């Protein structure tokens, strides 16, 4: 005792141990999920205009979000979703997409409620479900020349339909997917959409990477699917949108009859979000609406630039025998290390975690074992994947190449 | 169904309903709890250095707080508390003191746990306790021009509230709304009662720099053997008059802090990097200029003490009897004279008087105050319906506009 019950089990964070080993050794870091280059000019300038503009911006703003920010969000994503969005009832600014999730979990998930989670998942889905008193129900994506694609990682309609029960309160969908990089097709979404409707289940859709799409694929918001607006909470992140993760500004879009409860959580937790950062994000969105689908917009330019970095890393990793799975989205790609697993199983606990450590110590490269994105039971079978982030400065990628090339020489001498 | 159980009852917010009325009418707003003047130059400049400095500040910082910020917090309040503070185990940067409170409640308060709360309280204490599954135990301050100092805490009644279910006691000093600064006698009473019943003490000290009339803020965490049981909360917004920054922190022992860290990384994980760097920079200057006449921690309370004294005499001229605060942004006034000479005020049945009065004052006099009723538990609202709260931390222009409104009221009182 002398502590809360909801903190049971959820106290351990696997992310940290790797950060500890990484600092100790000289390494090229590809495990970090943030860009190591500056945000675009208009984004940085917008923040400078907020701190050097009206002095009244240094004080409290309205509780459910800076009104200019809520307005642009409503009108911009309104068009995109093809939906009438009321900036008061349908929008809520949160402390990043992380806070957005938390707000949603606390508002809807109760004691003994079930939450369907798709593996591999953004790891925080499980603790947040547990802390909310609910119990996570996991459904697994099945993995699919020499290279794999994130598109052929299938969602078996059987196993999914079987997981739905009368206790199922919510389904958490993350697209584009972290860590896999999978972008969900209309077929897959309509499957989820119809199952949620049939079982009367709320769908929390994590779309923080909706702008990071490659190879002509387009992001499809499940909230725009027929009759799904009534049941979905759409989450986005300003940090991942404008490559400014240290801003920690997020938002949730949904119907009033659901949003009202998230508002309750909000004003009984943080009440306010920082005023200036909201104004910066508000300004940045105004420009992107003005330049929408135009070749000089950041939403067109940045994914193309990052797709180039994606393509780079994929071939670079191939040169050492790692088999990457080509992502259609997100900041990340994962690589299969099965070949390393059989040719080198004697590593000094799921295998990929041992592999990453060995790679940090001996090769000077940092990746993330996908094990931590899987539920503890399923960690036995999916112990042979690791995650790289290709959203890095070109210098970082060049440093990676040198390390990768020394790896050849290490094997060749 | 289709919603969580913890959101029961806590869905209604009394603050909002007044803002609706205030917005529609032409009024001088003294109900707002934020300064309507800019933050000090060094504070604003510090924020500009963060957004125009290293580009790496635009990205994630360490999960439990920006390392330079945690360090200065540790060394600065370390000296103040007279305690060795480890920036890793003893410090946690949160989304303002509001987030700080929330983190503490979620970490410690469980199902059926009791939380001792002192009336009048910062209203959010009751919902946060309820949502955490705990049930609030209220103890009332008794009134003795009036002073916030003689609002006494009965040692008999207080000791009676402590049970084996009592998990935590929430102490707010300097107090919102009352403005009371707790004496060493009162703190030692609380301290010994908490120790004897093995109870954690969450102390809200966001106004610790706002102290007047030569009174000093005493942190209960510095009392002998209290560091082991206390979580100390502060806010950068209230500290540097920059409420829109929403940066806060909690200081305590590791064996308690570890659980707040669990809550933190399973909720928001990160706090904004740049705002933290600004607060870190602002604190560095104030440590450098500590107790010196050119520091903000010396100048600002002095400047605000005048605004207090100003408002106190201005409100008297209309028959309002203020209770002189020793701290915080606020003073409350007794409206009992208005209550007997004018009880016929319109409103819903079983609606406390000060709420009817504040409405009446906005509509007819063009002044905004806050009914203290919302700082009391619903049962106790029957007895404490005759106080309203003013915020005197305003620009001099706002105070002048207040005087003009008050003088029209006076002339109104000098004829009709």
């Amino acid at each position: 005792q002398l502590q809360a019950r909801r903190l049971d089990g959820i106290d351990y964070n696997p992310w940290v141990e790797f950060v500890k080993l990484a600092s100790e050794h000289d390494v090229v870091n590809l495990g970090q999920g943030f860009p190591d280059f500056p945000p675009p000019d208009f984004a940085v300038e917008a923040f400078q205009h907020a701190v050097s503009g009206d002095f009244m911006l240094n004080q409290y703003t309205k509780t459910f979000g800076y009104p200019p920010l809520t307005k642009i969000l409503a009108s911009f994503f309104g068009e995109l979703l093809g939906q009438e969005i009321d900036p008061l009832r349908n929008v809520l600014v949160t402390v990043g997409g992380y806070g957005a999730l938390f707000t949603a979990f606390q508002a809807l998930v109760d004691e003994g409620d079930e939450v369907i989670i798709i593996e591999p998942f953004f790891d925080c889905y499980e603790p947040m479900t547990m802390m909310a008193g609910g119990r996570p129900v996991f459904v697994s994506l099945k993995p699919g020349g020499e290279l794999g694609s994130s598109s052929n990682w299938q969602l078996d309609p059987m196993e999914l339909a079987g997981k739905f029960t009368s206790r199922t309160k919510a389904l958490v969908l993350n697209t584009p997917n972290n860590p896999l990089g999978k972008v969900f097709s209309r077929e897959e979404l309509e499957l989820v959409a119809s199952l949620c409707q049939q079982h009367d289940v709320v769908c929390i859709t994590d779309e923080v990477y909706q702008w990071m799409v490659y190879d002509g694929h387009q992001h499809i918001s499940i909230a725009s699917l027929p009759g799904m607006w009534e049941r979905t909470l759409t989450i986005g992140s300003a940090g991942k949108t404008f490559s400014a993760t240290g801003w920690k500004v997020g938002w949730v879009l949904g119907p009033d009859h659901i949003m009202k409860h998230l508002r309750t959580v909000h004003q009984n937790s943080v009440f306010h979000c920082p005023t200036q950062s909201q104004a910066a994000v508000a300004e940045s969105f105004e420009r992107e609406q003005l330049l929408f689908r135009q070749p000089s917009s950041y939403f067109v330019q940045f994914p193309q630039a990052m797709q180039r970095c994606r393509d780079h890393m994929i071939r670079s990793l191939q040169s050492v025998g790692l088999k990457p799975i080509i992502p259609q989205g997100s900041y990340f790609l994962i690589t299969d290390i099965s070949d390393f697993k059989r040719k080198m199983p004697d590593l000094p606990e799921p295998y990929d975690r041992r592999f990453v450590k060995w790679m940090i110590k001996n090769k000077g490269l940092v990746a993330i074992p996908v094990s931590i994105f899987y539920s503890v039971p399923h960690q036995k079978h999916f112990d042979h994947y690791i995650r790289f982030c290709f959203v890095k400065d070109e210098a970082t990628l060049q440093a990676m190449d040198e390390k990768l090339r020394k790896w050849k020489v290490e094997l060749e001498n």
Side-chain angles (χ1 to χ4, degrees), chain A:
Chain A
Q1 53 193 44
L2 287 161
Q3 71 185 25
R5 188 196 89 228
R6 61 188 73 89
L7 305 182
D8 287 355
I10 66 158
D11 51 77
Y12 176 59
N13 181 232
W15 280 103
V16 177
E17 65 183 352
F18 293 104
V19 189
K20 183 177 293 173
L21 183 62
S23 179
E24 298 154 6
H25 287 260
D26 199 68
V27 288
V28 177
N29 205 327
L30 304 166
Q32 298 163 340
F34 56 86
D36 58 349
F37 47 83
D41 296 312
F42 72 93
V44 185
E45 286 161 3
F47 206 170
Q48 297 173 336
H49 296 158
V51 296
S52 309
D54 188 4
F55 71 93
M56 272 289 296
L57 287 176
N58 281 292
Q59 308 304 325
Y60 287 142
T61 185
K62 298 201 85 183
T63 171
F64 303 124
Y66 187 53
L69 176 57
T70 62
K71 282 169 182 180
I72 181 76
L73 282 172
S75 72
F76 186 83
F77 289 94
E79 284 177 304
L80 293 192
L81 291 172
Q83 184 74 65
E84 294 269 305
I85 297 177
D86 175 29
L88 303 165
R89 286 166 188 82
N90 303 139
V91 189
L92 171 70
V93 182
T94 57
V95 195
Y98 224 101
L101 294 165
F102 178 78
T103 306
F105 283 112
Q106 295 296 312
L108 307 180
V109 178
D110 205 10
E111 299 289 322
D113 278 345
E114 282 169 8
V115 177
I116 299 179
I117 301 175
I118 301 171
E119 292 182 309
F121 54 85
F122 188 66
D123 59 344
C124 86
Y125 297 158
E126 182 175 20
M128 282 183 172
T129 293
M130 276 188 63
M131 184 176 163
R135 47 178 304 268
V137 173
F138 305 97
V139 52
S140 295
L141 289 170
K142 322 282 183 175
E146 178 266 336
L147 285 176
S149 180
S150 290
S151 53
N152 59 52
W153 281 57
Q154 307 290 358
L155 181 62
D156 182 24
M158 274 259 293
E159 190 195 352
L160 179 58
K163 297 303 175 177
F164 277 94
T165 71
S166 59
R167 291 304 289 166
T168 295
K169 185 68 160 283
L171 180 144
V172 182
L173 158 77
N174 174 229
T175 169
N177 185 272
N178 182 3
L180 183 56
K182 173 185 180 65
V183 177
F184 282 71
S185 62
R186 181 176 292 268
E187 302 81 276
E188 290 163 330
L189 291 182
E190 258 156 17
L191 165 65
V192 173
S194 64
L195 268 166
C196 281
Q197 277 158 358
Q198 188 204 325
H199 284 265
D200 194 15
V201 172
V202 175
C203 177
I204 294 97
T205 168
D206 189 345
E207 299 177 4
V208 293
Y209 291 119
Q210 66 170 281
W211 298 113
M212 310 301 303
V213 283
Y214 317 112
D215 303 332
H217 289 117
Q218 304 174 60
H219 172 77
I220 309 282
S221 297
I222 188 166
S224 65
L225 289 185
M228 281 303 284
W229 168 255
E230 294 75 75
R231 323 178 144 278
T232 52
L233 296 173
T234 307
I235 292 172
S237 170
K240 309 287 180 66
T241 295
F242 297 110
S243 305
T245 61
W247 289 16
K248 292 295 291 189
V249 165
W251 54 87
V252 182
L253 308 169
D256 181 54
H257 74 279
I258 310 183
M259 287 295 293
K260 52 188 280 189
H261 307 107
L262 280 81
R263 287 195 292 265
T264 298
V265 173
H266 185 72
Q267 61 189 15
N268 293 308
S269 60
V270 296
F271 207 104
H272 311 101
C273 284
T275 304
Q276 271 130 334
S277 57
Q278 287 190 73
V281 177
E283 182 173 335
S284 296
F285 261 117
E286 286 172 28
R287 179 193 169 272
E288 278 302 311
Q289 188 180 49
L290 207 157
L291 311 189
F292 189 49
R293 289 178 198 163
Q294 307 218 66
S296 48
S297 84
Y298 188 76
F299 290 165
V300 174
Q301 283 185 312
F302 188 60
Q304 288 171 8
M306 291 312 102
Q307 189 182 301
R308 227 182 310 280
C309 297
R310 184 201 65 175
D311 297 346
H312 187 142
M313 183 170 291
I314 295 171
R315 212 166 91 270
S316 294
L317 292 178
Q318 267 187 307
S319 72
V320 198
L322 299 171
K323 293 165 289 173
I325 292 89
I326 304 178
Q328 291 74 59
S330 81
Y331 284 4
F332 322 100
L333 64 88
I334 66 162
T335 61
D336 179 73
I337 62 169
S338 301
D339 279 343
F340 273 88
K341 192 178 166 192
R342 58 173 54 87
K343 304 307 166 195
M344 204 188 294
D346 301 321
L347 283 183
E349 177 183 4
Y351 182 80
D352 52 17
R353 303 201 191 197
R354 313 214 217 101
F355 185 85
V356 166
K357 289 187 187 182
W358 175 84
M359 195 180 65
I360 295 164
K361 302 175 78 55
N362 294 261
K363 305 302 169 179
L365 291 168
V366 185
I368 305 301
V370 182
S371 289
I372 65 176
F373 301 102
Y374 278 90
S375 68
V376 181
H378 289 67
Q379 287 195 8
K380 298 283 285 177
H381 309 81
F382 295 91
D383 61 340
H384 59 103
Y385 300 99
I386 56 169
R387 187 200 76 174
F388 290 95
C389 173
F390 53 78
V391 184
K392 302 294 168 188
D393 183 46
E394 284 297 335
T396 316
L397 292 169
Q398 291 311 123
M400 176 198 66
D401 285 336
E402 304 200 38
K403 294 285 173 171
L404 288 168
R405 283 156 66 169
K406 208 159 195 289
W407 196 341
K408 273 194 283 185
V409 178
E410 286 295 314
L411 297 177
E412 289 170 0
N413 284 323

